[PDB]
Ligand binder design. Sequence first.
Ligand SMILES: CNCc1ccc(-c2cc(-c3nc(-c4ccc(S(=O)(=O)C(C)C)cc4)cnc3N)on2)cc1
Ligand SMILES: CNCc1ccc(-c2cc(-c3nc(-c4ccc(S(=O)(=O)C(C)C)cc4)cnc3N)on2)cc1
Ligand SMILES: CNCc1ccc(-c2cc(-c3nc(-c4ccc(S(=O)(=O)C(C)C)cc4)cnc3N)on2)cc1
Lengths: 1342, 139, 139
Amino acid sequence: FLPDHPELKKIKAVLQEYRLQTTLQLSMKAIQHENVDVRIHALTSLKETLYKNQEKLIKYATDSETVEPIISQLVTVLLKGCQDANSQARLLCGECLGELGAIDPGRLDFSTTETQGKDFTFVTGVEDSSFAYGLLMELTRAYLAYADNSRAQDSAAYAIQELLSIYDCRHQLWRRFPEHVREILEPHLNTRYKSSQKSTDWSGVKKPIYLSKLGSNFAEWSASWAGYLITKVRHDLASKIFTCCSIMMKHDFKVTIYLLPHILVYVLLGCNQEDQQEVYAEIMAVLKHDDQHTINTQDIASDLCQLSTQTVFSMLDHLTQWARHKFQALKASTVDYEDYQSVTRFLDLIPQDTLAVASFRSKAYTRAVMHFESFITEKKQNIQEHLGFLQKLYAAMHEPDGVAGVSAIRKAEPSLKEQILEHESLGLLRDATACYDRAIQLEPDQIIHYHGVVKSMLGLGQLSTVITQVNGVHANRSEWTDELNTYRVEAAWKLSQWDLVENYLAADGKSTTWSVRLGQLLLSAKKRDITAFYDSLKLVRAEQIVPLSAASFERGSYQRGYEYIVRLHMLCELEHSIKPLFQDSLNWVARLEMTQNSYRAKEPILALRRALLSLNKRPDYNEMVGECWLQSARVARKAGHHQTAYNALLNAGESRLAELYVERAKWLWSKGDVHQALIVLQKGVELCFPENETPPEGKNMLIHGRAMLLVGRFMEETANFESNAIMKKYKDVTACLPEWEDGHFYLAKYYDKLMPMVTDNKMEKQGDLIRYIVLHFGRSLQYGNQFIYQSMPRMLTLWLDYGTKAYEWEKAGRSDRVQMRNDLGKINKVITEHTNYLAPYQFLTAFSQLISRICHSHDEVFVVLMEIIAKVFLAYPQQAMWMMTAVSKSSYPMRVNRCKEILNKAIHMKKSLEKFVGDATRLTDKLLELCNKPVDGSSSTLSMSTHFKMLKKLVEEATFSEILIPLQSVMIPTLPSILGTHANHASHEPFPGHWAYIAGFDDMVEILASLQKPKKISLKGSDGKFYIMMCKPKDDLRKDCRLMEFNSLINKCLRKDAESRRRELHIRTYAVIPLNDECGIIEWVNNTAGLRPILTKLYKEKGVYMTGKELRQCMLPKSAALSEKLKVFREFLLPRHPPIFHEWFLRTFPDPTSWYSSRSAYCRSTAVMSMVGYILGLGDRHGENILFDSLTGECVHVDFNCLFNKGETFEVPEIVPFRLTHNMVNGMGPMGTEGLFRRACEVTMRLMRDQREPLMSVLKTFLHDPLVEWSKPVKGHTGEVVNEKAKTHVLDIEQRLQGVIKTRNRVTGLPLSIEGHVHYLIQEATDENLLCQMYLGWTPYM
Amino acid sequence: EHLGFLQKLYAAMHEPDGVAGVSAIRKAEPSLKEQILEHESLGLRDATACYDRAIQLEPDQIIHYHGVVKSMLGLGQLSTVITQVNGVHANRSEWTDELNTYRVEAAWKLSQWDLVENYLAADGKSTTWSVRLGQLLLS
Amino acid sequence: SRLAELYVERAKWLWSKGDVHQALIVLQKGVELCFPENETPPEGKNMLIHGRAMLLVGRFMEETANFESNAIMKKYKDVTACLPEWEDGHFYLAKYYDKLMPMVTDNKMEKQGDLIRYIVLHFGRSLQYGNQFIYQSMP
Ligand SMILES: CNCc1ccc(-c2cc(-c3nc(-c4ccc(S(=O)(=O)C(C)C)cc4)cnc3N)on2)cc1
Ligand SMILES: CNCc1ccc(-c2cc(-c3nc(-c4ccc(S(=O)(=O)C(C)C)cc4)cnc3N)on2)cc1
Ligand SMILES: CNCc1ccc(-c2cc(-c3nc(-c4ccc(S(=O)(=O)C(C)C)cc4)cnc3N)on2)cc1
């Protein structure tokens, strides 16, 4: 009902008698409602609400890295609604989004959009009840659909009767159909019907049905071809059904659509060679014909070409699915084999290349790519001649990486047009401009070249030149002037030359360009035209929504359509800026900040805002325009395009801004001319902040602080400057903005860098320095959590290490002990103050490390540590308990005693925690028992009740406390965003989301042969969902746990970065929880299977398979020379296993769109994981350890025990960076490594290099972790262990991040590589010499 | 106080070092004109955008269009130069006479002889090196 | 008609920018595009361009850290073979041998001997064919 008014308040008193986030959920549920008017009211109310609660909404969006979950759900819902049929609803929902803002897909989270689609219900045959049922539903919806012809509804009910003839509903058949269909079909289900139409013979008329009078119209062509076919099929039941539905077919084409596929299947089963040739003729004709290619009266044809293409495609698709299912049957008789053979033969008759060309004609890009790769492989056809078509395709799809790959592959020199394609897809547009000029010289009669020239000009921002260029072109040719008018319009309105806008607009009444529409709106604003304004507003909103409509029906849709979403954002902002003029609550700053960080996103919004400000007449507009030009800088500077803001860095101009200087400095710094930047910056500082008068006020003090900090950083970079001056500058920055975090942070970093040098690397001397360091770090934290990941861990490491060294010196008998002791006391006091000031979650973030050092030797240090950990525990008992469990049950007694001390202190602080602690202890003990429960016999499945009674009971008791199901989402804390820093540090919610407590266990427990017989359990969550948790004996997971943490941090990074996001790079992460050193519980990842098993099944299906003994024969002695091994490999192992993985892709995903999306995801995921592994030195990537999700196609890695180049230590050393066997490559597609995969690798590598500091700090903490079983277990168990290769491991990790291979022999001085790094890595992985050496277990041949 | 004058001088002397030094000395922010001068003295890409902003600031000045056309020349964008001069002419007939030299140079470089002849015919007052070269080549 | 020349000058420009790797790839592709091993390039100027390209690839390799010493050495030797009388080949080969010697010999001249003989001989021949690097070579 969703009333919103006092009358609605009467209804609400009613609802109270019956019984912002709340209202939001309500409106959400509303919009989903079926009644269109219901939804419309919902949407209107929602739009108003959003406008009214804009403040709280923005706060939700920007307070924390990730948006409030409710927001994510709401945006998913709105984008869905975009798909709705009613135009009004679509427009309303577009307004919804635009009002929300253009949230960076990163900040949003889409797990709801599983989008299975309820599709792929391939029907094996007509006989199948479900298929005949769908046919009956078709006919019923048909007869009801139209009353225009009594004969037609009569034909549908007649087919109902004939279906009763084929099979009686009276009771499975009746059971099959629903009641809204049941009651509709019942009146004629039994009555009777005369033949709806007079008999006609499609076979009598002989002609290619396409291009025939009957085939003139699409539906009529559907009617003539299907009738002919029905005549053709030699199937009595098929003939019966076909005749039954014939009459209905004449009236509605859609019934024809449903029927044709199986009609063809039956025609294939019962075949005449001449009939087969005629069928292939019809299909080829439909495919061969290009509506633009052939000339005829197009009233029928225009629609006919497209529709017929789609129909033939669908028919072939059903044929393919039928053939695959029949091959599965055959493997699982002879008549079915013959039928399947006939169908496969007909399929073969069709040309893949033809299919691809047609598809491309029909804009069915994805299917085109699929067909084209299928062609390039199925029939081997060389490297070099089809590249043009494939490149054009990728261009269409807008997949840049496709174009880049295609280029990377082409051997022959690239044609000019191809270089144009490449520069457009990805290029600085400078080469683009010059190539355009050269094209104009090469071709003087093509408009598109001038298009590109003008577009480039605009990009650089040379408006006036663009206007004049358009005018010139106009002078040369009048006709082109119409097409080119758009860019002139854009320049004008951005130029703020309204009159020119009016002229050019009046000139053309045929341009639908976004730019032209924007100019129209701005004009209607300039000259107050309320009615026209709002009309154009509706129109443009609809237009924009159009593309997003199709975009919605896809995974990751939001991202794919983000451009249009930003357009809607601009529209909303424009509306709210204009309204007051006609007769502006929105907060522009926050809005902009929510947007993704890339040109495509920010720039257009900013230009539009400059325009609006121009239309607005406010005194401060002159300066606001400077802020907008300066806001364009740091939105482009970050991207590159350094000339793309000359008309910005200059444009800013008048508005007084030391900010102008700071910006010019950052720019120079990006460009590499550091000394320049320092000069310009010192000058701007002197000028804007003369020493005589202090800047004490607001933005002035702020900018002064920022400038001083930047000066300091520059000075650090330059080698000339003295340490002391740097330290002084940083201290000054701190003094001028004590509240700022960056100040203290950089100060601490610099002191840290200096300390090793000043102290000679002697801890004793370092003490005082360490105090200063930790103090400033903690302060920085207290202000903001931007650099938390680098700050916290470093501080903790330093303090704890100093404590350890002091304990050693006290035990030693060395004089420095007393000074060290006083220093340590001071340090501990500092830590205490930090504890008091810092919020709990901030410690939570390194809680892992904290726990790691629980066994520290010095008691005072331990007291402090315990205070910290206890504060945390109280703050977040669930996560803390999970993380501490293992240590609790450690075999080492000291670990257990200390953890118990901690828990006791906590309990003392908050009693209620005691009950929960006891419950958790009991639950963990029982789970450990289970994990270690010995299986008897095969015992594939064991009932919970039969064996694990105590567990079911314990969970059953109502007294038992709720235990949060361990899940990565609930373990990895989120953090407050920089934008919002007020009271966020105090009230920040670490784990905003849905918390599922353990409500019970499904009875059945699975035991898996592989993985050393690990039990698999399924917990039952409070929400009712079931989560499957594998229980693993004999594995130390601590390593895996911390690695998962690091992966989560990497995932955050990947999400924030534009380039990674657009590709949707992400590392699949599964929660891991160690019950104790030997046993831990690991979350299951469903729909996923190992590469080895999958390919093994494929091979067996192909009949080609290698026996284990065969392999043993192929195996050779390790001492054998490399030549013999390479031989064995190439000669036998590679031959035996041909590349088939692409087939797995094909079968798993039938639909072209799903196929393409999943293939892309596969490439991206494998790339990301390979890079990450090579950085972390992941090893043992053997078939089973790597996995692929059947649902998305992504790749997931497991068995992260082998880390930090432990593989080399193996008897058979691992000599490859990551697992890239020929099969995986084949998977990626014909392009192979080159293409998507390469670009993903490169992007991931770049990102990692950028965040090198935070990752490196975290990894440091990880490597020096004492709890981790770095070595073999000794005696079964100070409860501390030290990793001997720690320093070496950190050095190697750093180098790899640096990009310094250091492998080079005979010369150890090597400049870092950049992309050549990814290239050399790929080469190494691919090389056969290496692989052949690799151990058989890795199954390199596969 | 007098830095503008010294910069102008060094510009006249064709002494780039002078202008660079001036710029380095100035405390105040550089005006757009002085910026144009410095760009021109010390070698073109940045100067094109500066010229664009200039034109936007003052439309009537012809020197700015001169600079933009020259730049487009240096980069090798002949065709663009032709179209640009043509557009300017469309807007202002007068300017066409001063700008004809660039068009002629472009053409002659394009090898488009008809355009060379026609443009050279347009006006008979240019003595620019480029214009004489075009006359010779056409002959 | 100047494919080889094209790719070579291009590699040079690219290097100028700094993307050494993108240079090496394009250059190797060109080496395959023209003078493609199917038959030995003896065609005079063609042989010259072939040698120039080979030497360029060799110096590139030297720049990149991945490539092994032996391969670089072999490439320089190939350039030497291709053009016996071209100084550049000999000079660069000598330079690379010099740089390698200290590590190979562990900085023990005794072992350094034979390498020294090779190096000196190649310097000398380089001098016979030209005088571009005399100041580096002779001393
Ligand atoms: C018109 N006369 C001047 C001229 C013009 C072009 C050339 C030329 C052509 C090639 C060439 N480039 C590639 C290549 C390039 C880029 C990428 S990329 O991934 O960065 C992404 C940007 C695509 C990947 C591969 C592959 N094969 C090739 N044959 O190299 N130089 C030489 C002279
Ligand atoms: C209207 N346009 C917007 C706008 C306005 C002003 C600024 C601005 C002003 C200054 C500034 N520069 C210098 C300086 C010194 C030496 C050279 S140099 O020739 O040696 C070099 C080519 C190597 C160049 C410049 C000296 N004092 C200064 N105050 O820096 N940025 C930036 C954008
Ligand atoms: C020395 N360290 C020992 C060690 C060993 C294993 C792990 C481990 C395992 C998983 C994990 N595996 C799967 C999984 C695995 C295989 C297949 S399979 O079809 O190929 C067929 C072979 C069953 C299907 C699914 C799903 N979800 C998961 N979380 O995670 N960690 C960790 C440490």
